[PDB]
Structure formats: structure tokens, C-alpha cells
Task: inverse folding
DNA sequence: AAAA
């Protein structure tokens, strides 16, 4: 089904853009990546690297999750990510976001075997 | 921005 790994690529992976094409990159994406499903995922960051690179992060700098859980990993490098916040105009089903684009390290939670990304924690 |  909707696997964990699989859940990460849907929500958190857009390797099709080097970055947010526009400010709607977030209303177009969220919406579409089924994040607006049966709610407005309030905040979500899209990474713009490959998958093989993002998955790498699981063999990368191990850091704590904001959670306190221990399988997070920051990227040694720095990724292009588009961070998505909903705007105070978001009203489900009418999900509307504030695209913020940045180049930051990413921090993800790894999991499985293969140990791959399964939750996206931060960016720094 | 992660799930008996």
C-alpha cells in the first residue's frame, strides 16, 4: 500500500524542480501530492534533490529528531527545498500555502531495511 | 513535514 518510504516520496519529494517555480509551488504541490486529502497539511517541505541523494541522508550525520527520537539525519550537504506553510487563508477543503524557497541542510528520520527516509524533520 |  501506501508504504512509509512511499509515503515520504509523495509528500516530501519533488525532484522535478530545482526549486519552487512560483509561489504557488506549494498550493499546486500540496494539493496534488494528496496532502490536502482530508485536511490541510499545515506544513510540509519539499526537497528538490534526487531520491538517491535524499535517501543518502540515512547514512549521513546522525542527529536527534526534534522529536527526541534518534533516527534522524542531517544532510552533510545542502538541498534545495521548498518549505510550505499554510496561510491564514487556508480553510479546508480550501488549502492555501506560503511557498518559501531555500537552500538548507535537511534533516530526516530514517527507517527500514533498506534504511530509507520515512519522515522529514527539519532543515537548517 | 513518522507511524496500532
Result:
Amino acid at each position: 500500500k501506501e508504504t512509509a518510504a512511499a509515503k515520504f516520496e509523495r509528500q516530501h519529494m519533488d525532484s522535478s524542480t530545482s526549486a519552487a517555480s512560483s509561489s504557488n509551488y506549494c498550493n499546486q504541490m500540496m494539493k496534488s501530492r494528496n496532502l490536502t486529502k482530508d485536511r490541510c497539511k499545515p506544513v510540509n517541505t519539499f526537497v528538490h534533490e534526487s531520491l538517491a541523494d535524499v535517501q543518502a541522508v540515512c547514512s549521513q550525520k546522525n542527529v536527534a529528531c526534534k522529536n527526541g527520537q534518534t533516527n534522524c539525519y542531517q544532510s552533510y550537504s545542502t538541498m534545495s527545498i521548498t518549505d510550505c506553510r499554510e496561510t491564514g487563508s487556508s480553510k479546508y477543503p480550501n488549502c492555501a500555502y506560503k511557498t518559501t524557497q531555500a537552500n538548507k541542510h535537511i534533516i530526516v528520520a530514517c527507517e527500514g531495511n533498506p534504511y530509507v527516509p520515512v519522515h522529514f524533520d527539519a532543515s537548517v
User: Anything to note?
Assistant: Residues 1-124 of chain A form a domain with the P-30 Protein fold (CATH 3.10.130.10). The CA atoms of residues 80 and 103 of chain A lie 4 Å apart. Chain A has three helices and seven strands. The radius of gyration of chain A is 14 Å.
